[PDB]
Amino acid sequence: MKGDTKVINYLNKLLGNELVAINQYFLHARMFKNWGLKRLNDVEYHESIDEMKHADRYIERILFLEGLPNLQDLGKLNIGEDVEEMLRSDLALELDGAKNLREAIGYADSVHDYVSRDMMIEILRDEEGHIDWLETELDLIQKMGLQNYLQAQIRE
Amino acid sequence: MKGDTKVINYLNKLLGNELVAINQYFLHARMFKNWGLKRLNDVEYHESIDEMKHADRYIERILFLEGLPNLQDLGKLNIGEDVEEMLRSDLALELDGAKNLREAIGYADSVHDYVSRDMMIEILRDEEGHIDWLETELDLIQKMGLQNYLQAQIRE
Amino acid sequence: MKGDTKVINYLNKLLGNELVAINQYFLHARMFKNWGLKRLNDVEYHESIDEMKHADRYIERILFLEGLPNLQDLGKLNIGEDVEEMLRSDLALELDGAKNLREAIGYADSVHDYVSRDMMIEILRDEEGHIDWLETELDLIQKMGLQNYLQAQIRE
Amino acid sequence: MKGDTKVINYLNKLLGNELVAINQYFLHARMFKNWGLKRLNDVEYHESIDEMKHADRYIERILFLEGLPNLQDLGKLNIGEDVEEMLRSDLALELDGAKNLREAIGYADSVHDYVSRDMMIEILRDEEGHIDWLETELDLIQKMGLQNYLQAQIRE
Amino acid sequence: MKGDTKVINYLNKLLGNELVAINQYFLHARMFKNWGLKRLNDVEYHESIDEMKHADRYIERILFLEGLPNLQDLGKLNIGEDVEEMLRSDLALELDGAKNLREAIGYADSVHDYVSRDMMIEILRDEEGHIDWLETELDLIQKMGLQNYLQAQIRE
Amino acid sequence: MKGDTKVINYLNKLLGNELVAINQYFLHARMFKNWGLKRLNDVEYHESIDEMKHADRYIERILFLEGLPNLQDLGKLNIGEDVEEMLRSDLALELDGAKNLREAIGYADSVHDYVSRDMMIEILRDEEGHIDWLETELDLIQKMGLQNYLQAQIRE
Amino acid sequence: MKGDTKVINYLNKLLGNELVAINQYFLHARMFKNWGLKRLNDVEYHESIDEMKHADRYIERILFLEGLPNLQDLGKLNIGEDVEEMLRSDLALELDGAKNLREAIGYADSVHDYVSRDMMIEILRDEEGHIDWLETELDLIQKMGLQNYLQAQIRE
Ligand code: HEM
Ligand code: HEM
Ligand code: HEM
Ligand SMILES: [Zn+2]
Ligand SMILES: [Zn+2]
Ligand SMILES: [Zn+2]
Ligand SMILES: [Zn+2]
Ligand SMILES: [Zn+2]
Ligand SMILES: [Zn+2]
Ligand SMILES: [Zn+2]
Ligand SMILES: [Zn+2]
Ligand SMILES: [Zn+2]
Ligand SMILES: [Zn+2]
Ligand SMILES: [Zn+2]
Ligand SMILES: [Zn+2]
Ligand SMILES: [Zn+2]
Ligand SMILES: [Zn+2]
């Protein structure tokens, strides 16, 4: 089915977002794992998989709409060197992708691509979930302090 | 069976207490849950259910005694903004309801409504239980300090 | 995540609707139960739980959007004294809440809060279900007459 | 253990009440059964057993308190000739026994026989239950009319 | 295998009958379902499936006899607005299709298409069954009156 | 619940689309089955059922919105005489129904019938799926040629 | 443990290779899936996962050797527009990565990083496997011709 060109661009753009998220989350996961923060590796790893499912959904959609998925361009990774810095980076990224999702969803609706819209809304719901988690951890770090927070990540 | 009017008023009054408790506990639960204090959400949620069972018991009793359960009037909620403040509020409330229960129980006995009395005593036993729990948490917060207490609520 | 203020007000308003529904349905349930209309107690009770799940959804959402859930204000309960009157009251209430849901959903979409919107649409679908049921019972009462309808509620 | 004499008299008196209830309920049960009102035979039969458990409790208590259980004197049975009349009789009887229970309970407390009291309160709770049931059936008969009520008792 | 042309026309004609029956029965089913007459929705729905199996049988037969099944032409639906009217319509339709089946069966035999005949006879046996059911319900409505009949359809 | 009239017309129109799809797909299925293309009969048959579930959804919705489902009018079937021609016909039909779904969805949203909208979106997602399948088969026929394609349908 | 700097560069370089392979294989997989070549989607998808396991191994190794895994730089994807072209591209890529692996393995041995070496050898064994598969498919396409090859990918 020939899709709307601008919807495809959006889908590619969003795809692009998930592909930076996928890498940044996986690196973070294995950084935490290395440091022995087993619990943070577990969650961020599972978030990496999450972003991958998203990427796949865009890819299959672009192909269905007869567009060319762009996995060539990779946006800026921002890794960070300590837990806070790195959580905070993941959150800024999820925040930028939500902004992009909000725009794309609106546009899909206005060109009547309701199923792309529908898939985008479910994705944003997942993103909003990741946002929740990042915010919560970042706040726990302040309430209980960094040392206690770190100890709390040692077991899975 | 026509019940004693004043017993019905008491039962309504007590019902009224449980219905503020139900809401305050549920809000607290989901506040804790949002903050990531999984353990406190678990307990306060289960206390919300507890107060609901109580409310139901009064409702069925008032109806049996041929009175009109009043679910219209809702007493003052006091929510609080941090764990201590909020635990402390739940405790003041349980304390006021116990006082009311003590009064009502005495009166039921003196008009010979022994089964209302019996149901009230079992309820107060549950309340006293909630009082125990609130007091214990509040004391743990002092003994181990707030940061360690918070870390201790992260897992269920 | 800071939500849109007016979306939060809507969410609180809707929350407020569910909290009257929760009480009115529960009272009705136990009123029917008392009268021995076992079947009506079963359904309205299960509708009470239904409205509670809704309330919870709003609460967790308002908290996520960083607003303050208001469980303090309770709208007007209208109880009624016989089956019809009471069914008819539940229906007027579901009807007012659907109207509010329709208004809120539109607004969520226009400020791009697509996930609040999404949760609201699923809720309205449930409400519309309750509307169906109330309408159906009210019509059965006319087609088969009140006496036969009452007999039909004696067993679960 | 030598019990208080007046407590024993009360226990005997109450025993006496259960033994009329036992017979009246059983006769009613088998009257309903004969008429084909299977459902009413089921409940009243189970109430007969209920009263028997009560009788047993008094008997074992009187014997423990070193009194002589009197199963010789049997109060006035009032049978009735149709469903209503007969339900209405069972209800007047439960009502008289509740009155007696209330008096006895008060007295047990004042001579410090707290366990007799305790057993009496549990019994009265059961009685109050039977009262509920009789009242409910009697009201169903008015709401739905006698013919529909009778049809509703044909299956168990 | 080249079939007899007139047999194919008959098969198409009969097919045509089943395709009105299929729709009329399904609409009726969901009309009853909507009204809360759960029991009538269950049966008419299962009759819709029944007619579909019939249609399929004709279709596969026409194709085997090398004819073109006509699913394009749809006879007159007669829906009705109340239970009786609608049952009575389903019955007139089954009656017309039985008449057509009787004619077709005779003709198949006389051109030696014994297997088409055989399949038609089994179908007519099913139809005759549906006729039985419709007649019986229509008579129950008179014997027990409409109100009692309606109550009797509330549970499945 | 009284629905918006134009929404009902749309729902009827869409219903009408599914009812041509149901027949065309079933005929195609049994045409393939007859030709021994077991694999195509399996899929198109399962698509026929799919369209039937859709029809049912519209029917129950129209009835809920207090409209009259029209199963009387049947649009133009286009059958075709060979695999390609017939696949190509099914695709043109799915394409016209998607167009209609897109218009109806927009309109539902603008009159606030969000649940009709919601059901329509899920349907369109299924349709879009059928579109995918038809397009894919049509392209396989070109890539691998007709003879190889036919052989590939012989087993299920 | 501080690793040898040049070993880390190699590990990063190789990592870089797996991350182009991961994307190219996944796109290919879903391209085949879209075209209905179910069998090729299955294998290339499983090769994508394979390359991901590899990437993970490098990442955990670089982190253990105290280096910074570079997931930022992404080499040139070469996608292709038909099966052959695309298989042929995957093969050229596996061939370049094997060359790099051979170089790195030698160097690891000469600086005594025998475990990095060991992990690299196991990886190359997997790569050599993928090479085998690509070569085999490419040859089957010539022996049996493109049409027959395509038909052979339709089922999993
Ligand atoms: C380039 C950095 C990546 C790394 C290090 C990585 C790592 C992993 C790992 C370790 C797994 C678990 C293997 C398993 O399923 O058992 C996995 C699963 C998966 N990956 Fe990736 N991945 C990456 C990128 C991608 C990309 C770009 C895609 C394509 C959208 C993708 C798609 C998938 C899918 C669909 C699964 C299966 C999920 C499941 O069912 O568990 N990955 N990945
Ligand atoms: C208005 C604020 C309330 C909220 C947010 C709330 C929430 C909940 C939730 C989430 C559940 C679990 C659902 C389940 O049973 O699986 C529940 C259960 C229940 N609620 Fe409420 N509730 C509220 C008020 C009430 C009231 C006023 C009553 C009536 C006395 C009530 C009676 C019950 C009962 C009987 C259960 C079943 C307990 C069980 O067996 O688990 N609730 N409530
Ligand atoms: C007129 C041509 C039709 C034919 C030849 C046909 C054929 C069939 C067949 C063979 C089945 C399988 C029976 C089973 O469920 O075991 C079926 C199922 C079904 N049909 Fe039809 N059908 C037709 C039209 C319709 C229509 C107009 C509706 C109403 C919307 C409908 C609704 C259904 C439903 C709800 C099922 C059950 C699906 C399931 O759970 O498997 N059909 N049909
Ligand atoms: Zn994502
Ligand atoms: Zn995310
Ligand atoms: Zn309580
Ligand atoms: Zn309490
Ligand atoms: Zn609700
Ligand atoms: Zn509702
Ligand atoms: Zn007794
Ligand atoms: Zn009794
Ligand atoms: Zn038939
Ligand atoms: Zn029939
Ligand atoms: Zn459809
Ligand atoms: Zn379709
Ligand atoms: Zn590799
Ligand atoms: Zn490889």
Side-chain angles (χ1 to χ4, degrees):
Chain A
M1 214 175 73
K2 255 217 53 166
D4 164 281
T5 291
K6 189 146 224 277
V7 175
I8 296 168
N9 294 335
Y10 265 128
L11 260 27
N12 266 309
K13 169 154 159 132
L14 298 180
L15 169 59
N17 287 338
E18 304 283 353
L19 40 240
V20 8
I22 290 165
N23 288 179
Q24 173 164 315
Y25 273 135
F26 203 89
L27 215 213
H28 287 165
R30 303 275 115 120
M31 279 185 58
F32 295 134
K33 166 145 144 91
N34 187 250
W35 290 334
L37 284 22
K38 219 107 51 68
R39 217 264 248 149
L40 255 21
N41 160 82
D42 285 0
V43 169
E44 294 249 294
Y45 173 88
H46 290 298
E47 271 161 10
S48 204
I49 298 324
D50 238 272
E51 305 306 17
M52 289 175 216
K53 302 203 206 178
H54 295 165
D56 187 13
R57 285 172 80 200
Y58 294 125
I59 290 161
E60 290 180 357
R61 188 63 185 169
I62 301 184
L63 260 12
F64 168 61
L65 298 178
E66 303 181 20
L68 279 355
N70 179 358
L71 286 77
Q72 171 79 74
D73 301 321
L74 191 62
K76 199 197 167 159
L77 255 44
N78 175 8
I79 306 310
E81 302 157 292
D82 56 42
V83 184
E84 220 201 303
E85 212 163 316
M86 52 205 268
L87 265 30
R88 222 178 257 301
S89 188
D90 288 328
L91 166 65
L93 192 52
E94 291 271 1
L95 256 16
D96 282 335
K99 198 170 284 133
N100 295 155
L101 265 163
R102 302 202 144 95
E103 188 194 336
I105 286 156
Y107 176 77
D109 188 272
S110 67
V111 287
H112 295 97
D113 190 348
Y114 298 113
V115 3
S116 298
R117 175 164 151 126
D118 198 62
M119 158 210 281
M120 292 192 286
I121 284 162
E122 288 320 283
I123 290 171
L124 173 66
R125 183 179 170 185
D126 296 353
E127 300 304 5
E128 205 117 311
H130 301 155
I131 286 150
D132 197 9
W133 184 78
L134 268 341
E135 284 167 347
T136 309
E137 293 308 288
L138 280 181
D139 289 348
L140 285 168
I141 298 176
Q142 305 297 288
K143 301 218 190 81
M144 81 178 59
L146 181 54
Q147 293 183 320
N148 277 171
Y149 182 86
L150 266 12
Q151 170 194 2
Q153 318 305 324
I154 275 176
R155 312 170 162 269
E156 30 217 8
Chain B
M1 214 175 74
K2 255 217 53 166
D4 165 281
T5 292
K6 188 146 225 276
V7 175
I8 298 168
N9 294 335
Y10 266 128
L11 260 26
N12 266 310
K13 169 154 160 131
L14 297 180
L15 169 59
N17 288 337
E18 303 282 353
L19 38 241
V20 8
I22 290 165
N23 289 179
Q24 174 164 315
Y25 273 137
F26 202 88
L27 215 213
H28 287 166
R30 303 275 114 119
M31 279 185 58
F32 295 133
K33 167 143 144 91
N34 187 249
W35 291 335
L37 284 21
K38 219 107 51 67
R39 217 265 247 149
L40 255 20
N41 160 80
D42 283 1
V43 168
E44 295 250 293
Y45 173 89
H46 290 298
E47 270 161 11
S48 204
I49 298 324
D50 238 272
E51 306 304 17
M52 289 175 216
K53 302 203 207 178
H54 294 164
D56 188 13
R57 286 171 80 200
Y58 294 125
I59 290 160
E60 291 180 357
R61 189 63 185 168
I62 300 183
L63 260 12
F64 169 60
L65 298 177
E66 303 182 18
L68 278 356
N70 179 357
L71 286 77
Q72 171 79 74
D73 301 321
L74 191 62
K76 200 197 167 160
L77 255 45
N78 175 9
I79 306 311
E81 302 157 293
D82 56 43
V83 183
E84 219 202 303
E85 212 162 316
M86 52 205 269
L87 264 30
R88 222 178 257 301
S89 188
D90 290 327
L91 166 66
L93 192 52
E94 290 271 0
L95 255 16
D96 282 334
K99 198 169 284 133
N100 294 156
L101 266 163
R102 302 202 144 95
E103 194 193 358
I105 286 155
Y107 176 78
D109 188 272
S110 67
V111 288
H112 294 98
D113 190 347
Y114 297 114
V115 4
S116 298
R117 174 164 152 125
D118 198 62
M119 159 210 283
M120 292 193 286
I121 284 163
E122 288 320 283
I123 289 171
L124 173 66
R125 182 180 170 185
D126 296 353
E127 300 304 5
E128 205 117 311
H130 302 153
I131 286 151
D132 196 9
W133 184 78
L134 268 341
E135 284 167 347
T136 310
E137 293 307 289
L138 281 182
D139 289 347
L140 285 167
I141 298 176
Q142 305 297 288
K143 301 218 190 82
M144 81 178 60
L146 181 54
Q147 293 182 321
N148 278 171
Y149 182 86
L150 265 13
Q151 170 193 3
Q153 319 304 326
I154 275 176
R155 312 170 162 270
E156 30 216 8
Chain C
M1 214 176 74
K2 255 217 53 167
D4 165 282
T5 292
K6 189 146 225 276
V7 176
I8 297 168
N9 294 335
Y10 266 127
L11 260 26
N12 267 309
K13 169 154 160 132
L14 298 179
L15 169 59
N17 289 337
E18 303 282 352
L19 41 239
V20 7
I22 290 164
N23 289 179
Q24 173 164 316
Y25 273 137
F26 203 87
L27 216 213
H28 286 166
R30 302 276 114 120
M31 278 185 60
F32 296 134
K33 167 143 144 91
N34 188 249
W35 290 334
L37 285 21
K38 220 107 51 69
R39 217 265 248 148
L40 256 21
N41 159 81
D42 284 0
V43 168
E44 295 249 292
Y45 174 87
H46 290 299
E47 271 162 9
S48 205
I49 298 325
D50 238 272
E51 306 304 17
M52 289 174 216
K53 302 204 206 178
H54 295 164
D56 186 14
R57 285 173 79 200
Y58 293 123
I59 290 161
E60 291 180 356
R61 189 63 186 167
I62 300 184
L63 260 12
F64 168 61
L65 299 178
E66 303 182 18
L68 279 356
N70 180 356
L71 286 77
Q72 171 79 74
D73 301 321
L74 190 62
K76 200 196 166 160
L77 256 44
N78 175 9
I79 306 311
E81 302 156 293
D82 57 43
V83 184
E84 219 201 303
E85 212 162 315
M86 53 205 271
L87 265 31
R88 222 178 257 302
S89 188
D90 289 328
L91 167 65
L93 191 52
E94 290 271 0
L95 256 16
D96 282 334
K99 198 168 284 133
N100 294 157
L101 266 163
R102 302 202 144 96
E103 202 198 339
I105 285 155
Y107 176 77
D109 188 272
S110 67
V111 287
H112 294 98
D113 189 348
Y114 297 113
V115 3
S116 298
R117 175 163 152 126
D118 198 62
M119 159 208 283
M120 293 192 286
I121 286 164
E122 289 318 285
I123 289 172
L124 173 67
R125 183 179 169 186
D126 294 353
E127 300 304 6
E128 205 117 312
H130 301 154
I131 286 151
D132 197 9
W133 184 78
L134 269 340
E135 283 168 347
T136 311
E137 295 306 290
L138 280 182
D139 289 348
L140 286 166
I141 298 176
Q142 306 296 288
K143 302 217 190 82
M144 81 180 58
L146 181 54
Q147 293 182 321
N148 278 171
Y149 181 86
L150 264 13
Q151 170 194 3
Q153 318 304 326
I154 275 175
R155 312 171 161 269
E156 31 216 8
Chain D
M1 214 175 73
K2 255 217 53 166
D4 164 281
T5 293
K6 189 145 224 277
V7 174
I8 296 167
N9 294 335
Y10 267 127
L11 260 27
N12 266 310
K13 169 154 159 132
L14 297 179
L15 170 59
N17 289 337
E18 304 283 352
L19 41 240
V20 8
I22 290 164
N23 289 179
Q24 174 164 315
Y25 273 136
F26 203 88
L27 216 213
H28 288 166
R30 303 275 115 120
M31 279 185 60
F32 294 133
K33 168 144 143 91
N34 187 250
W35 291 334
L37 285 21
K38 219 108 50 69
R39 216 265 248 148
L40 254 20
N41 160 80
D42 284 1
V43 168
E44 294 250 293
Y45 173 88
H46 290 298
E47 271 161 9
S48 205
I49 298 325
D50 238 273
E51 305 306 15
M52 289 175 217
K53 302 204 207 178
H54 296 165
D56 187 14
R57 284 172 81 200
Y58 293 124
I59 290 159
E60 292 179 357
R61 189 63 186 168
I62 301 183
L63 260 12
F64 169 61
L65 298 178
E66 303 181 18
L68 279 354
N70 179 358
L71 286 78
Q72 172 78 75
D73 301 321
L74 190 62
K76 199 197 167 159
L77 255 45
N78 175 9
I79 306 310
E81 303 156 292
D82 56 43
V83 184
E84 219 201 303
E85 212 162 315
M86 53 205 270
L87 264 30
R88 222 179 257 301
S89 189
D90 289 328
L91 168 65
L93 192 52
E94 290 272 0
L95 254 16
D96 282 334
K99 198 170 284 133
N100 294 156
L101 266 163
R102 302 202 144 95
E103 193 187 346
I105 285 155
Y107 177 76
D109 188 271
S110 67
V111 288
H112 294 97
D113 189 348
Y114 297 113
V115 5
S116 297
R117 175 164 150 126
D118 197 63
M119 159 209 281
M120 292 192 286
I121 285 163
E122 289 319 284
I123 290 171
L124 174 65
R125 182 179 170 186
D126 295 352
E127 299 306 5
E128 206 116 310
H130 302 154
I131 286 150
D132 197 9
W133 184 77
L134 268 341
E135 284 167 347
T136 309
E137 294 307 289
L138 280 181
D139 289 347
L140 285 167
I141 298 176
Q142 305 297 288
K143 301 218 191 81
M144 81 179 57
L146 180 54
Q147 293 183 320
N148 280 170
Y149 181 85
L150 264 14
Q151 170 194 4
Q153 319 303 326
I154 275 175
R155 312 171 161 269
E156 31 216 8
Chain E
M1 214 175 73
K2 255 217 53 166
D4 164 281
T5 293
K6 189 145 224 277
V7 174
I8 296 167
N9 294 335
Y10 267 127
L11 260 27
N12 266 310
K13 169 154 159 132
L14 297 179
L15 170 59
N17 289 337
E18 304 283 352
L19 41 240
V20 8
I22 290 164
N23 289 179
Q24 174 164 315
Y25 273 136
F26 203 88
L27 216 213
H28 288 166
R30 303 275 115 120
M31 279 185 60
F32 294 133
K33 168 144 143 91
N34 187 250
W35 291 334
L37 285 21
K38 219 108 50 69
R39 216 265 248 148
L40 254 20
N41 160 80
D42 284 1
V43 168
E44 294 250 293
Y45 173 88
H46 290 298
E47 271 161 9
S48 205
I49 298 325
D50 238 273
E51 305 306 15
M52 289 175 217
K53 302 204 207 178
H54 296 165
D56 187 14
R57 284 172 81 200
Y58 293 124
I59 290 159
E60 292 179 357
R61 189 63 186 168
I62 301 183
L63 260 12
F64 169 61
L65 298 178
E66 303 181 18
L68 279 354
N70 179 358
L71 286 78
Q72 172 78 75
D73 301 321
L74 190 62
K76 199 197 167 159
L77 255 45
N78 175 9
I79 306 310
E81 303 156 292
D82 56 43
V83 184
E84 219 201 303
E85 212 162 315
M86 53 205 270
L87 264 30
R88 222 179 257 301
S89 189
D90 289 328
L91 168 65
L93 192 52
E94 290 272 0
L95 254 16
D96 282 334
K99 198 170 284 133
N100 294 156
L101 266 163
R102 302 202 144 95
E103 193 187 346
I105 285 155
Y107 177 76
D109 188 271
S110 67
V111 288
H112 294 97
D113 189 348
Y114 297 113
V115 5
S116 297
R117 175 164 150 126
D118 197 63
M119 159 209 281
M120 292 192 286
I121 285 163
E122 289 319 284
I123 290 171
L124 174 65
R125 182 179 170 186
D126 295 352
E127 299 306 5
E128 206 116 310
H130 302 154
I131 286 150
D132 197 9
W133 184 77
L134 268 341
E135 284 167 347
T136 309
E137 294 307 289
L138 280 181
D139 289 347
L140 285 167
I141 298 176
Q142 305 297 288
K143 301 218 191 81
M144 81 179 57
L146 180 54
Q147 293 183 320
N148 280 170
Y149 181 85
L150 264 14
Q151 170 194 4
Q153 319 303 326
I154 275 175
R155 312 171 161 269
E156 31 216 8
Chain F
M1 214 174 73
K2 255 217 53 166
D4 164 280
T5 292
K6 189 146 225 276
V7 174
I8 296 168
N9 294 335
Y10 267 127
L11 260 27
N12 266 309
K13 169 153 159 133
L14 298 180
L15 170 58
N17 290 337
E18 304 283 351
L19 40 240
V20 8
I22 290 164
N23 288 179
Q24 172 165 315
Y25 272 136
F26 203 88
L27 216 213
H28 287 167
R30 303 275 114 120
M31 278 185 60
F32 295 132
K33 167 144 144 91
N34 187 250
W35 290 334
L37 285 21
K38 219 108 50 69
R39 217 266 248 147
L40 255 20
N41 160 80
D42 284 0
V43 168
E44 295 249 292
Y45 173 88
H46 290 298
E47 271 161 10
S48 204
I49 298 325
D50 239 272
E51 306 305 15
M52 289 174 217
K53 302 204 207 178
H54 295 164
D56 187 13
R57 285 172 80 199
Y58 294 124
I59 291 160
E60 290 180 357
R61 189 64 186 167
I62 300 183
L63 260 12
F64 169 61
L65 299 178
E66 303 182 17
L68 279 355
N70 180 357
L71 285 77
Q72 171 79 75
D73 301 321
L74 191 62
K76 199 197 167 160
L77 255 45
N78 174 9
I79 306 311
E81 302 156 293
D82 55 43
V83 183
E84 219 201 304
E85 213 162 316
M86 52 205 270
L87 265 29
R88 223 177 256 301
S89 189
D90 289 327
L91 168 65
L93 192 52
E94 289 271 1
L95 254 16
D96 281 335
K99 197 169 285 133
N100 295 156
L101 267 162
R102 303 201 144 96
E103 350 204 314
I105 285 156
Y107 176 76
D109 187 272
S110 67
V111 287
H112 295 97
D113 188 348
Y114 297 113
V115 4
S116 298
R117 175 164 151 127
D118 198 62
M119 159 208 280
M120 293 192 285
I121 286 162
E122 289 319 284
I123 289 172
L124 173 66
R125 182 180 171 186
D126 296 352
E127 299 305 5
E128 205 117 311
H130 302 154
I131 287 150
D132 197 8
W133 184 78
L134 268 340
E135 283 166 347
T136 309
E137 294 307 289
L138 279 182
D139 289 347
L140 286 165
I141 298 176
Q142 305 297 288
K143 302 219 190 80
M144 82 180 57
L146 181 54
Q147 293 183 320
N148 281 170
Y149 181 86
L150 264 13
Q151 171 194 3
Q153 318 305 325
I154 275 175
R155 311 171 162 270
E156 31 216 8
Chain G
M1 213 174 74
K2 255 217 53 166
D4 164 282
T5 291
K6 189 146 225 276
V7 175
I8 297 167
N9 294 334
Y10 266 127
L11 260 27
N12 265 310
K13 168 156 159 131
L14 297 180
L15 169 59
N17 289 337
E18 304 282 353
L19 39 240
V20 8
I22 289 165
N23 289 179
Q24 173 165 315
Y25 273 136
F26 203 88
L27 216 213
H28 287 167
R30 301 277 113 120
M31 278 185 60
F32 295 134
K33 168 143 143 92
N34 187 249
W35 290 334
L37 285 21
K38 219 107 50 69
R39 217 265 248 149
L40 255 21
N41 159 81
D42 284 0
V43 168
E44 294 250 292
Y45 174 87
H46 290 299
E47 271 161 10
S48 205
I49 297 326
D50 239 272
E51 306 305 16
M52 289 175 216
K53 302 204 206 178
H54 295 165
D56 188 13
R57 286 172 79 200
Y58 294 123
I59 290 160
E60 291 181 356
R61 190 63 185 168
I62 300 183
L63 260 13
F64 168 61
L65 299 178
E66 304 182 17
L68 279 355
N70 180 356
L71 285 78
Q72 171 78 74
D73 301 321
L74 190 63
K76 200 197 166 160
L77 255 45
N78 175 8
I79 305 310
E81 302 157 292
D82 57 42
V83 183
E84 219 202 303
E85 212 162 315
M86 52 205 271
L87 264 31
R88 222 178 257 302
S89 187
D90 289 328
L91 167 65
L93 193 51
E94 289 272 1
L95 256 16
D96 281 334
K99 197 169 284 133
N100 295 156
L101 266 163
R102 301 202 144 95
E103 210 193 321
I105 285 155
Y107 176 77
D109 188 271
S110 67
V111 287
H112 294 98
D113 189 347
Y114 296 114
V115 4
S116 298
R117 176 163 151 126
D118 197 62
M119 159 208 282
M120 292 193 286
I121 285 164
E122 289 318 285
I123 290 171
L124 173 67
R125 183 179 170 186
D126 294 353
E127 299 306 5
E128 205 118 311
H130 303 153
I131 286 150
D132 197 9
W133 184 78
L134 269 340
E135 283 166 348
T136 310
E137 294 307 289
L138 280 181
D139 289 348
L140 286 166
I141 298 175
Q142 306 296 289
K143 302 217 191 82
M144 81 180 57
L146 180 55
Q147 294 182 321
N148 279 170
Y149 182 86
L150 263 13
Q151 170 193 3
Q153 319 303 327
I154 275 176
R155 311 171 161 269
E156 30 216 8

